[PDB]
Amino acid sequence: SLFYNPQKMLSYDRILNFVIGARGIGKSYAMKVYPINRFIKYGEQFIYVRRYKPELAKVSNYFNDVAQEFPDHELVVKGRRFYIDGKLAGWAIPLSVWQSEKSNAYPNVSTIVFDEFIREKDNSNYIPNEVSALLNLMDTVFRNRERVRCICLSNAVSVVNPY
DNA sequence: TGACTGACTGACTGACTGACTGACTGACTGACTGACTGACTGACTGACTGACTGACTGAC
Numbered sequence: 530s531l532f533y534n535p536q537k538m539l540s541y542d543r544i545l546n547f548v549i550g551a552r553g554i555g556k557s558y559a560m561k562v563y564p565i566n567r568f569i570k571y572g573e574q575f576i577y578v579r580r581y582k583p584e585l586a587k588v589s590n591y592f593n594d595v596a597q598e599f600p601d602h603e604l605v606v607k608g609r610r611f612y613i614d615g616k617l618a619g620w621a622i623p624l625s626v627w628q629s630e631k632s633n634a635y636p637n638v639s640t641i642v643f644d645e646f647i648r649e650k651d652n653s654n655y656i657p658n659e660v661s662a663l664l665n666l667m668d669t670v671f672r673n674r675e676r677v678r679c680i681c682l683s684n685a686v687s688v689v690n691p692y
Numbered sequence: 693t694g695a696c697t698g699a700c701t702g703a704c705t706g707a708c709t710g711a712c713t714g715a716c717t718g719a720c721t722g723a724c725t726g727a728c729t730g731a732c733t734g735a736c737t738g739a740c741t742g743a744c745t746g747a748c749t750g751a752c
């Protein structure tokens with residue numbers, strides 16, 4: 530079809546979703562839509578996870594392109610706040626800034642959302658203790674035994690990456 | 693039935709780390725660097741040596 534929807538991928542239900550490359554397949558907007566559908570039909574909070582703090586413009590770069598595809602429901606963009614049908618459930622999450630994470634109470638999020646996972650020829654100033662950072666986040670949110678999933682996508686097929 | 697608001701707020705900067713790149717270099721080393729005891733034996737030598745001269749008798 531045109532834009533594959535990842536439900537068949539989600540069928541296996543392992544938490545780690547290693548999707549690689551796929552420039553322009555619509556995994557970006559599928560992983561935008563999916564938590565919105567989950568919050569609408571069940572009531573699960575969602576958090577758009579990036580790596581750094583300085584990006585604030587992603588108030589509108591995440592949510593506009595997927596706002597219209599929903600036919601008959603209401604959406605509100607309030608900066609770091611995301612509202613679906615007048616219910617506040619979405620916020621941006623920086624990884625470089627970890628400390629604000631350790632103060633913030635965890636919203637109940639079924640699946641963490643993340644594409645552009647790989648760094649291609651960056652300045653190499655990524656997050657130190659990177660795999661340890663992801664482990665610390667996973668322990669931090671849902672310290673109970675309730676299961677939590679994660680979706681992570683890389684721009685290009687880098688066969689080996691730190692995780 | 694309302695009119696600034698005082699404390700949350702987008703944001704939009706204002707100062708600062710390291711990572712990576714752009715030449716030194718002085719550190720390090722290797723390929724000369726011309727000497728310097730050894731070989732040794734090419735040339736040199738006294739040390740050591742075996743057969744011709746030297747004739748009054750064996751013989752007369």
Ligand SMILES: Nc1ncnc2c1ncn2[C@@H]1O[C@H](COP(=O)(O)OP(=O)(O)OP(O)(O)=S)[C@@H](O)[C@H]1O
Nearest residue numbers: 532550551552553554555556557558559598644684
């Ligand atoms: N719900 C949707 N409604 C409309 N178009 C969609 C939807 N989901 C995906 N797409 C399409 O998906 C295409 C690819 O856009 P992205 O979602 O950014 O792809 P992407 O797969 O994240 O690329 P990568 O892998 O991150 S480099 C766009 O042209 C959209 O039209």
Ligand SMILES: [Mg+2]
Nearest residue numbers: 556557644645
């Ligand atoms: Mg993407």
